[PDB]
Chains A and B, each alone.
Chain A
Amino acid sequence: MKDPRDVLKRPVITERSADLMTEKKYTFEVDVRANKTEVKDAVESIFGVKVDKVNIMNYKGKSKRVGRYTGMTSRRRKAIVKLTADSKEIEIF
């Protein structure tokens, strides 16, 4: 990473994500080459909060089809950041 805004891509808005958000946990899509400490520091810098823990998944691509052609979607990296008893990242969802 060079600028922390290149580590976080976009937030994840689902039912599971909205459920976890009430436990003070936030879910982001992360650059596939970023590691836990990188995400921790990026969230520290961008939002000015205190981070307690970070967990990361790796997701394979899915097979899709539009008519006769077949392909795969991109791989994804997902991070669940647990903030401490501090402020609240306003995702303005």
Chain B
Amino acid sequence: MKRTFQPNNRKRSKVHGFRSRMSSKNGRLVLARRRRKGRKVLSA
């Protein structure tokens, strides 16, 4: 029950994906900021 964008582009997920965001302190900062704003969608 969601919306998916390019569910086959692997490079999209390897650049802007959740596991790449969680692999460095700066990406975790990005995720923290987006959680603070209240975004419905975190990362790709």
Which residues from chain A sit less than 8 Å from chain B, CB to CB? Answer: 61, 71-72
Contact = CB atoms under 8 A, between A and B. Distances in A.
Contacts, number: 4
Interface of B: 1-2
A72 B1 CA distance: 5
B21 to A, nearest CB: 26
Contacts of B2: 72
Contacts of A61: 1
Nearest to B1: A72
Nearest to A73: B1
Nearest to A61: B1
Nearest to A72: B1
